[PDB]
């Protein structure tokens, strides 16, 4: 956020002012059943990317490969 052009006074996420806070999942089963942390490995490239390989199969046939 700093590198993106936003200077930061203070630190942390315990906003003293008029903002919403998020304290962290209480380590009790009640919240551990409703919530789970964001797994970064589940954010993926869309598989439609693989449909661009169709161009390759058509070129190989045009060049006689």
């Amino acid at each position: 956020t700093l590198r993106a052009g936003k200077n930061i006074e203070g630190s942390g996420q315990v906003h003293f002012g008029y903002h919403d806070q998020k304290w962290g999942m209480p380590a009790i089963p009640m919240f551990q059943l409703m919530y789970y942390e964001l797994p970064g490995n589940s954010i993926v490239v869309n598989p439609c990317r693989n449909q661009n390989y169709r161009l390759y199969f058509e070129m190989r046939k045009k060049l006689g490969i």
């Binding site: 490239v45 990317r49 661009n52 161009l55």
Partner: protein
């Protein structure tokens, strides 16, 4: 301080040395003020040439594939 090499060249620092006294040394700096306004204006009169000469148009629909770089995870 833009046009550094142009100004340094006009002052003669490539062949000689500036006067060791501030009075004349400073007058020599203000003497090129006209030439900088001239050489900068000349550099802004270049005619256009096709942009599609050494650069493919990135806005072409051919590049909407948003393809990734396939790698090998050695």
């Amino acid at each position: 301080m833009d046009n550094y090499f142009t100004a340094i060249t006009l002052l003669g620092l490539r062949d000689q040395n500036l006067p060791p006294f501030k009075d004349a040394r400073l007058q020599r700096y203000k003497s090129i003020k006209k030439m900088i306004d001239l050489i900068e204006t000349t550099t802004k009169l270049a005619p256009p040439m096709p942009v599609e000469l050494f650069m493919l148009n990135p806005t072409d629909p051919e590049w909407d594939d948003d393809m990734t770089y396939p790698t090998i995870t050695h």
